[PDB]
Design a protein around this ligand. Structure first.
Ligand SMILES: [Cu+2]
Ligand SMILES: [Cu+2]
Length: 128
C-alpha cells in the first residue's frame, strides 16, 4: 500500500485534505508538505504536525507562545509524534516517521500550529 502523501497548505489557510490514512502494513510513513501560495512564512506559514487528539490543543497553545523562530512548536514537546518544518510560499518539507509510533486504539489529529490556523487546518490521521 502507499506510505506517502503529498499535502499542500495555501494562502487561504487550508490544507488540501484534512484526512490521512496510514495503512497498518506501512513501516514508515511520509508527509510531503508544500505551499503553492505566494505569501511568506511569517504571514501564512504552515507546518504539518501530528499528535494524539487529546494533546493537540496543548501543542497548539504552547507553540503559539514559543513564536515564529521556533516554528511555533514548543521545544522538546514530547506530545509531537512527527512534524514538518514551517514553510512559506514555494518551499517544501517532508517528514518520515515510524508507524510503530502510532498506538492502535489511540486517536490522532493532524494540524498546523501557526497561531489561529488550526481553526481550519486540522483533521484526522487514521491508522487502518
Ligand atoms: Cu508496503
Ligand atoms: Cu498554517
Amino acid at each position: 500500500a502507499e506510505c506517502s502523501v503529498d499535502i499542500q497548505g495555501n494562502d487561504q489557510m487550508q490544507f488540501n485534505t484534512n484526512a490521512i490514512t496510514v495503512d497498518k502494513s506501512c513501516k514508515q510513513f511520509t508527509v510531503n508538505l508544500s505551499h503553492p501560495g505566494n505569501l511568506p512564512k511569517n504571514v501564512m506559514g504552515h507546518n504539518w504536525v501530528l499528535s494524539t487528539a487529546a494533546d493537540m490543543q496543548g501543542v497548539v497553545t504552547d507553540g503559539m507562545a514559543s513564536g515564529l523562530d521556533k516554528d511555533f512548536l514548543k521545544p522538546d514537546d514530547s506530545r509531537v509524534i512527527a512534524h514538518t518544518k514551517l514553510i512559506g510560499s514555494g518551499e517544501k518539507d517532508s517528514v518520515t516517521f515510524d508507524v510503530s509510533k502510532l498506538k492502535e486504539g489511540e486517536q490522532f489529529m493532524l494540524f498546523c500550529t501557526f497561531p489561529g490556523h488550526s481553526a481550519l487546518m486540522k483533521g484526522t490521521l487514521t491508522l487502518k
